[PDB]
């Protein structure tokens, strides 16, 4: 439904307004039951995650509990590890920039709460290098915490020993990928690996590893504190909890606000954030989960609600839940065209289908914006699109195909007219 | 992506970490597991850039030696990521975000403003080498859509004029109040908090027993 209470919200420091430093955090009481929780043991913590129903919170929303659980298997003499991706690259995502900058601590105890759940020896946080200032904030926060003894040996009074580190990203969206974050951490080129050697099995430095969206790590301590039920109650069925929503582009007050997941879309922009610029009638389309997810046209928006189950019914992905809105004042053919330009300037090129395919769609898309290309070419891009969708080594090729598929699926008449417009003036 | 040796950009340019920098390099290596120094390539290479913006081929070679990694590896990392200059770069090095979110909120205007403000075209740098204009991609901070990254700072939610003001500040004086030069605080609802209006909660609240 929606309408989460501020009291039941998780990052009270969102929008700042409270010292992102420890003191403000102590008034927040973020480090309240940390020793106790870890004392409970890895299993109990992971269990709470399952009860929570917390899905990914990052890109694909895999059940968090089960995922983390995959490394709750006995150590084989290799130190297990925690990797917390804070790349936050998906266009439209400033979701994570908040927790890191505004509430660094929540993530610090998220790390150790999560750490004992997987029995990780240590956690490395890959904040995108672009955010240099952001990094300045977290290690100040990390430094505070150890000074306190909250982390490190004798973590918060626990025999558990966990060390948290921050790693510099270098302006790559793909670094974000789970197998590629690792390789950047490993120091090689940021190129994803194949899934058959799964991340838990082969870890960073060949030591079991797990990767979580920073939001996913951050909520785990509060969910254990509030209990899985409290959390699981807010969401709809499988889709559960309240996910932060970042609305950017063609909305009166673009902002990131956390609301009950499964909140109706027409409502999200209506209640928080602000009205669609030019009236709700001025809504050509919206991309619910960021650039990777397909945009949905207005007909669906009034009805569709932001939860992953509802969106997959709608053929779109909740993803990072970044709402980008396009008024009737925008050349979508060019809007999506720059996202394909966003992906040609960024895919690693390791795999044949993404390398040439994304460049191929970029060339066709640029011609489509001009209208130089004939109408028959439009359904070809479709066929080029699905060749890329199922054949890619990672998901980015998955992601490049979806916006192209959305433009053809709902805005096929407009592209034909741009086709027609150029043919007429000759 | 080919380094054709040039008198300026080639190893004749000797590179070596200042004593202090080497100390920093050591810590960086400590974070990673022992026996995995190679993992510190990115961090160390960055430090080199901090030392010299150009990050010449010589620098890349030094990084390799310092981390005992094959020279090619350093090259791969440098030529793969984008935050590494691999050429001389402007003192200010402004970067304008032009992904759809920003563009939808009129990013193009900002770029145009800069082009003539700077007098230099994108992909190029000012004669004094004070400013280098680059059309970079999503830099995060999308909510404050109109946004650009001057050097390390993130100037956000900027209207065309604001930048001119900022650029002037950069041109005469320094530290031009880096951040969103708008009424909004960070990424709050511009008009008024849609939530988080009430005071934050307290320790232990609604906590399940133990």
């Amino acid at each position: 439904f929606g309408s989460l209470k501020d009291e039941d919200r998780i990052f009270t420091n969102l929008y700042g307004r409270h010292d992102w430093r420890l003191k403000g955090a102590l008034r927040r009481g973020d480090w309240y039951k940390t020793k106790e929780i870890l004392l409970k043991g890895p299993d109990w913590i992971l269990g709470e995650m399952k009860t929570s129903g917390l899905r990914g919170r990052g890109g694909a929303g895999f059940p968090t509990g089960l995922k983390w659980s995959f490394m709750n298997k006995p150590s084989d003499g290799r130190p297990k590890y925690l990797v917390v991706n804070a790349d936050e690259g998906e266009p439209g995502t400033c979701k994570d920039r908040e927790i890191m900058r505004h509430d660094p601590h929540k993530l610090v105890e998220g790390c150790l709460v999560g750490g004992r759940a997987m029995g990780a020896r240590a956690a490395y946080i890959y904040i995108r290098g672009e955010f240099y200032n952001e990094a300045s904030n977290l290690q100040v926060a990390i430094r505070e915490a150890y000074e306190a003894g909250l982390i490190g040996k004798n973590a918060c009074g626990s025999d558990y020993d966990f060390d948290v580190f921050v790693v510099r990203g270098a302006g790559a969206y793909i670094c974000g990928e789970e197998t590629a974050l690792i390789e950047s951490i490993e120091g090689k080129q940021g190129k994803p690996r194949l899934k058959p050697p799964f991340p838990a099995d082969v870890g960073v430095f060949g030591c079991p590893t797990t990767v979580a969206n920073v939001e996913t790590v951050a909520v785990s301590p509060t969910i254990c504190r509030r209990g899985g039920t409290w959390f699981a109650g807010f969401g709809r069925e499988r889709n559960s909890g309240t996910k932060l929503f970042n609305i950017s582009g063609h909305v009166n007050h673009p902002c990131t606000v956390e609301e009950e997941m499964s909140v109706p879309l027409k409502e999200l922009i209506e209640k928080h954030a602000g009205g669609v610029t030019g009236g709700w009638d001025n809504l050509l389309a919206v991309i619910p989960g960021g650039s990777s997810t397909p945009l949905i046209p207005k007909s669906v928006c009034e009805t569709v609600l932001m939860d992953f189950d509802a969106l997959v019914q709608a053929q779109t992905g909740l993803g990072t839940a970044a709402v980008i809105v396009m008024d009737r004042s925008t050349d979508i053919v060019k809007a999506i065209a720059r996202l394909i330009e966003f992906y040609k300037h960024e895919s690693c090129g390791q795999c044949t289908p993404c390398r040439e395919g994304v460049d191929w769609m970029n060339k066709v898309m640029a011609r489509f914006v001009k209208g130089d290309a004939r109408p028959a070419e439009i359904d070809s891009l479709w066929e080029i699109s699905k060749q890329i969708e199922g054949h890619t080594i990672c998901a980015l090729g998955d992601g490049a195909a979806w916006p192209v598929q959305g433009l053809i699926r709902h805005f096929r008449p407009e592209l034909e007219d741009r086709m027609q417009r150029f043919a007429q003036q000759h | 992506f080919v380094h054709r040796d040039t008198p300026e950009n080639n190893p004749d340019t000797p590179f070596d970490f200042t004593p202090e920098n080497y100390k920093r390099i050591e810590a960086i290596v400590k974070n990673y597991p022992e026996g995995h120094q190679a993992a510190a390539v990115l961090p160390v290479l960055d430090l080199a850039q901090r030392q010299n913006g150009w990050l010449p081929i010589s620098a890349m070679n030094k990084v390799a030696e310092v981390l005992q990694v094959p020279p090619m590896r350093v090259y791969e990392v440098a030529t793969f990521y984008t935050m590494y200059n691999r050429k001389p770069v402007g003192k200010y090095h402004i970067q304008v975000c032009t992904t759809t979110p920003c563009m939808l909120r009129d990013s193009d205007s900002i770029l145009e403003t800069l082009q003539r403000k700077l007098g230099i075209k994108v992909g190029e740098t000012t004669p004094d080498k004070l400013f280098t204009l680059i059309e970079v991609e999503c830099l995060g901070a999308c909510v404050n859509a109109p946004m650009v990254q001057i050097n390390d700072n993130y100037y956000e939610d900027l209207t065309p004029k604001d930048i001119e003001e900022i650029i002037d500040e950069l041109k005469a004086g320094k530290v031009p109040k880096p951040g969103p030069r708008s009424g909004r605080f960070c990424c709050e609802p511009a008009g008024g908090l849609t939530s988080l209006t009430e005071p934050p909660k307290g320790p232990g609240f609604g906590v399940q027993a133990g």
Binding site: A122, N133, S136, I142, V166 | K30, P33, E34
Partner: peptide, 22 residues
């Protein structure tokens, strides 16, 4: 306001806290 070495130098300061290596 932060310096170019804030991240690295701060980290070095944290080195002492950093738990022993693997």
């Amino acid at each position: 306001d932060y310096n170019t070495y804030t991240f690295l130098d701060l980290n070095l300061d944290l080195s002492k806290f950093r738990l022993p290596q693997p």
